[PDB]
């Protein structure tokens, strides 16, 4: 219900989802091309970013990210996307509260 120049889109509803994805928040101040994420949808993984995002994320401490699952074992690897409050992570987070209560 909005089509004008300079508009913030939700960017939600992402395609490609054979086994669904997990949602976690990233943390890391050192900055060694890798970060640590904790996620809902039952997952705990180390998140990695591409060279372009690596020099464009500059995460300080307390950011939200979407993660991909890597193998299983007693710890999973994940491919993460960094963003500070937008709509995609807000959607999955709202779903977490819905499942818990409400």
Swiss-Prot record:
HAMAP family: aIF_1A. One of its GO terms (molecular function) is RNA binding. Seems to be required for maximal rate of protein biosynthesis. Enhances ribosome dissociation into subunits and stabilizes the binding of the initiator Met-tRNA(I) to 40 S ribosomal subunits. One of its GO terms (biological process) is translational initiation. SMART domains: eIF1a (SM00652). This is Translation initiation factor 1A. Residues 10-85 form the S1-like domain. The gene is eIF1A. Keywords: Initiation factor, Protein biosynthesis. GO terms for cellular component: cytoplasm. InterPro entries: NA-bd_OB-fold (IPR012340), RNA-binding_domain_S1_IF1 (IPR006196), TIF_eIF-1A (IPR001253), TIF_eIF-1A_CS (IPR018104). Belongs to the eIF-1A family.
